Amino acid sequence: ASATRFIQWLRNWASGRDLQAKLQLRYQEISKRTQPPPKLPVGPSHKLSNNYYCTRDGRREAMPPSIVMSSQKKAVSPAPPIKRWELSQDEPYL
Amino acid sequence: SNLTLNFGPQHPAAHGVLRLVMELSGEMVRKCDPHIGLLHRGTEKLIEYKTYLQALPYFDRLDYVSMMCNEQAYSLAVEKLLNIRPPPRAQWIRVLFGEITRLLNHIMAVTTHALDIGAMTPFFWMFEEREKMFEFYERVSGARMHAAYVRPGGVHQDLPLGLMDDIYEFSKNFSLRIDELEEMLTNNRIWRNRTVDIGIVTAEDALNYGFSGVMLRGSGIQWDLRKTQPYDVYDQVEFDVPIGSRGDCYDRYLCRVEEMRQSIRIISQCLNKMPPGEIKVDDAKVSPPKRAEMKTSMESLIHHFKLYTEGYQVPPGATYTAIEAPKGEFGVYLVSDGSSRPYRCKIKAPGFAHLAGLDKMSKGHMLADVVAIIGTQDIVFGEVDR
């Protein structure tokens, strides 16, 4: 930011861009290194009632694998064929 | 004859040491035999003596340029066996830092790729940007690299106040930095002479050799796990997948540079769409309670004590979970026996298959084209060797 007006022109012209708008060194735009204290929220299970753990226990709803066949019709694919990707409307060609 | 490429460049480089046994005839490479294992540290056996939390830091040290992406893969695998769901703010944070990590990796991949070829100036310009992104890692986790921030259940801590504005400030100017990198390489006839038509791989050969990531997309294969098999909140962000047309080093180089631009595009959406709420699953049998709860509530203290000693138990089962890591498909085959320590943990490193293809990709090339070909695959022997 301290560069003279001539040097700013010189490096702007050499690079072809306006480097001063997007300096790669940081000045005052950064956040202050001291911040106000946070007050973080709590999750959905912070209830005093209607909150029995057996109604929200993900681990206990896991099950052993379903056995489709054990040694002890139309053809199917493992899933429907993948849909074709559409070309970008933002910038199709680089 | 027979040569052996040096362990590493004379300049400082961070991707591991390789013993490459080469067969040549004149200037031409007749055979490449990569001798790896020089960084094999028995990570997978060590993980079997750790609880599921204790094993998480082992994943920062695999592809130790894409730290949080490796964490996310392991966290998704454990969350899947636990049958729980991380909270939405955690998912947005994980995608936000997933793309920041993708920038970190692609800077390392592209500028060290140029540095090894001898174009060394862009390395210095772009690791000043990596230094600022290390500051983002250290501000959420206290560590510049091995954060151990993403965990099964969400993230360890919430973003410090003021972090998002600083990430916005960095992202504001980053595209110009990519533009300066392209000014040095993209149209440079010397760079193109070193990369164009080097290490061509056909689409079918790429699939059968087990490639993934840019190694597939450089050959025109329209595959990106963030699009086809989305995880976390990747289905709520807009981005384009770069696709190559010639399957060579130059097309893969352009894909990585364009992926960096799309990462900035995704980061812009994460900053604007970050929702409020908690950061880890509100389930004190998986995620430890807040320190204020641990010091006031009997249930909270018990769960804190047990989570930090025995750890949480994972229902028995096995999953293969993979993500679109910056280096390709990074997966884990995680086997649970019902206890609080994993029974088996195989790590699928994208660079393992890629380095296995070096012999194929280098046929009929010069000794210096092997340098470019290991460069375009972006190999980190931390993940190749485990």
Next chain:
Amino acid sequence: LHHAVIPHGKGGRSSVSGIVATVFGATGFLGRYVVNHLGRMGSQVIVPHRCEPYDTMHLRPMGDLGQIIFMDWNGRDKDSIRRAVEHSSVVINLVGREWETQNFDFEDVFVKIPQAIAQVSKEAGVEKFIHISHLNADIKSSSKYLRSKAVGEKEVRETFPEATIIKPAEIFGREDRFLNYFANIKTVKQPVYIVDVTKGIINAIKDPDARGKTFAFVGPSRYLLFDLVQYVFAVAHRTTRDKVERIHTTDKILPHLPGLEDLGVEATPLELKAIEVLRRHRPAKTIP
């Protein structure tokens, strides 16, 4: 025994050998082999050094963490000898030069310094003392090096009566001044391998009867100096006044003194170890 120095482990790097040794002259040729064998079995080694610490770096990997301790000392300062030997159970003296300097002559390194180490070691309560003299030491010798060895050996025996005195022949090894001496330039020699002498010293520490005795360490074969020197050039694909007089001194025969065999060490023929010593420079008749 004191509970700290009871042997423990399987005799490896992390084991406890029970030996606490102060090795004077540890930075030289013989010293580096002694420290290596002491650190191999998990001993506490005190290495007093006169030299720049950079010159002691090759000793650091020779022991587990905390097993090699370095100290500064001066040959003319008894207080720096007391500090070094105070906590040791054996003191080993390997001090010496093959030439005299302005500051130290052979009456210093081979008489005054060994006496001071023995005198202080005795006063401090050290149990075992190992002193290195020379096979050909003799007060009638034309070599002042060998004359001082005779006087020092005699004075060490007075000061520390239970000391174990070892009298090696010329020692050959990778860093010797023997085979490397010939390879760089009437008499019978019986050179002895460096590892044989080192094992002899290490067993003298362990063996109870070794106390108070004098040993002579000699190789298995006697060679005429001419043939030995002839052999070096063939194998190698090819100083001072006092040094020359030692190389021309015939290696004494001392059947009345015990040798390597008595300490359980079998002497290594010079033939099996000449290439090792000499390869970098790129079978003589044995007297019966």
Next chain:
Amino acid sequence: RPTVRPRNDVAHKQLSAFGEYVAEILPKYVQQVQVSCFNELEICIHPDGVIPVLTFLRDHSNAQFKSLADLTAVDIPTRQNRFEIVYNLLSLRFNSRIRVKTYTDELTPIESSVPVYKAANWYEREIWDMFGVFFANHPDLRRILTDYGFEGHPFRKDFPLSGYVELRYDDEVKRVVAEPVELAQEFRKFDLNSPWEAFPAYRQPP
């Protein structure tokens, strides 16, 4: 519920139907088919079926599992065939994954799958290196991760964590040497398993 992973019923039906499809077509080798509660389809096959089953899944029009994502082994010492060989495959056409498992013991060779997937070349070398499972008709089967001359297969459950030998540089012989392992601090084994059952849904019969 906010903390519970949602169920995907459509993919569970889809993967079940495809599992029966593969079982009906390959009865010579398929021993079991199951789909987990998080919707991963596993085909358990006799080891003789490695090449036919993997070729069918790669080439068949309704399968098209062109990418071998991973190939690994699991050691379960209590089983007569302690080693479980796991193939994880990816179908880009149908945006689906499948896992194919077989088994072997210490002395029984498995057929190399290099003909089906060139990706398998290094994976099988790693399984040989780390578990000691031999693959028949492998172009170049040798150690890949361990040091030259390394004895044993470290990923076996009965291989000690710190091994049997350790390295150091020895000044006497002027080279790196290998000696029996001694540890200044032994690894501290922890018994962490709670004596109370956690998951009734998985209870084994008495």
Next chain:
Amino acid sequence: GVRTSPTGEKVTHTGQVYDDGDYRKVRFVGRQKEVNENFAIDLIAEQPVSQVGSRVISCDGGGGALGHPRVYINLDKETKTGTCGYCGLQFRQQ
């Protein structure tokens, strides 16, 4: 309450000190024995007992969430003080 043994070695708050015949004290020769000199047993005994007017009092060590888990201390015995098992502060019913 640091003190020296006959050999002149400082005794730690844990009571450690190498005895006379111990060779291991050679590690301190030309160096020093690291000893912390703020003995916690002596500092906590300088704190004045607190007088309260209830049978039960709670201690969190001070600082709210920056202290230790909150515990409740019974003060029925009049022959001794109630001590906090986390921080060692003492209480007496008045």
Next chain:
Amino acid sequence: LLQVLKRGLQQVSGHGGLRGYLRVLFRANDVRVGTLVGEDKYGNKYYEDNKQFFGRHRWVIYTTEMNGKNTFWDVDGSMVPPEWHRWLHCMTDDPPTVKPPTARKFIWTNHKFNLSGTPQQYVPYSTTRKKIQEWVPPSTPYK
């Protein structure tokens, strides 16, 4: 360009003459003039210049003597005491002159820099007492 040269000459005067200018140039390899934020009890001086880019906007000029050591040429980062360490590394915005640390009687009054390689270096040892007490035989030969 004339104003650039003027700023260069104001740095000589800003350092109290040429001797103080050459002093900091050879000690710190830098001649910038900042605002003296404060000084600690060991003689270290702390400066700030918010016009500089982040990371260069704060700096310390180390003291020439600390704890009986000559640090005119031998300075290192471990010489900054903890109260100023927080400010210098931008963990906080307030220097200890504005927000002093809480007083505790066990806190070191005298900061010590890195003592490795000196006779004051830390030497590890086991802090536990002997586990097994041996039997001491009688001193009388009753036998």
Next chain:
Amino acid sequence: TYKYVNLREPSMDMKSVTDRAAQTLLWTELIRGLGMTLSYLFREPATINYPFEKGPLSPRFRGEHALRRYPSGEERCIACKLCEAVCPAQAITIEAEPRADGSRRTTRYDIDMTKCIYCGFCQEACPVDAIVEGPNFEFSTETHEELLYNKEKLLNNGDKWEAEIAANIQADYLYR
């Protein structure tokens, strides 16, 4: 959604052909690259004057360990061994016994700083904020043995750095 990174067909009109010929013969695209490195020469460097200037850190920074006290001076650690249990590297070794006043305190508290991964799990597991990773990172040593910390070393680190550790904890404890 996808895009092509390199699917452009060059224009073959004589003007465009001559434009490419000028680029080949006159090295114009090489001249352009020289401009970019020239523009950097006149930019202000990013270097900071270490050790007189320091890299910016945050209160969460995981540096050298320390054992903390209560304001009374009593040790916070109660020998619960949760840090020893969670340590991913098995870098902590603890022994404990009743103190002479009956207090539950450690007799051994070692951290092998060459085993530690500086992960901060111990300070998360600690229920009383006894063990922390402080802000110090400039503590390299000349010997391996100096990095094997015992309880005296760690307590001294706590007394040494408490002024800054307490402030860092005050600035971040509401995120924990």
Next chain:
Amino acid sequence: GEYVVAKLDDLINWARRSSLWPMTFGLACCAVEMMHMAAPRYDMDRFGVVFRASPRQSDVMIVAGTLTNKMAPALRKVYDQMPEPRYVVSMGSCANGGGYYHYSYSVVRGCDRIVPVDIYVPGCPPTAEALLYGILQLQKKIKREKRLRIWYRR
């Protein structure tokens, strides 16, 4: 004589510590922070520590990462080919004492079992600033050397 030797050590110590050319083994993670020390923020070159060197032109070897049994012989050979004076800087927990793989069958428990180490830089990884502190600590160690004073008193 005494005066000259003191000033002569001052000169050569100044020269050797002001021109420390490093060979880095970028073995693993820690090599990334090593690269950040060469990057513009810290610019190790400004201290005289050049960017690239070559083993046979190097003064200091920086072991930056995990050393496995498979790599141990090759690292010792590079150390043996370095011309003297040569120094070794052990960077990070893995090279310091094995770190997080200390109990592995395939990891050397500290590079000081293979080569003598002058400085140990703690961290996993040590920050680029921590490594720079260790490098400047090695310069002070060289500044303390007294090769000619010792030689003159032999």
Next chain:
Amino acid sequence: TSVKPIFSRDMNEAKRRVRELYRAWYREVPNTVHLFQLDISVKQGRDKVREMFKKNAHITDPRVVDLLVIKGKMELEETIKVWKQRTHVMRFFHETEAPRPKDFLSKFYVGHDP
């Protein structure tokens, strides 16, 4: 007891493959000593080869013999292709490991191991 074989279908087939391995190892020792510049004699190297084959003489399982031959061939290749360094070839001799007491009294003095 009907099992899939590796190479050999019986012990006589296996013994043939064993003898070819011995010939290959026997002939390579003189080259190994020279290429690696070992300080052992060719006779010493060949004695070690005999020692290694000898301690597997009791095996009567053809599958186990095939694995022993398979492993032995891999070791030969590592040596032939110079993938092993000097350190690797010399680990068969344990030069730095002091002799271990074998009798009862010697083991009783040193420690508790049998």
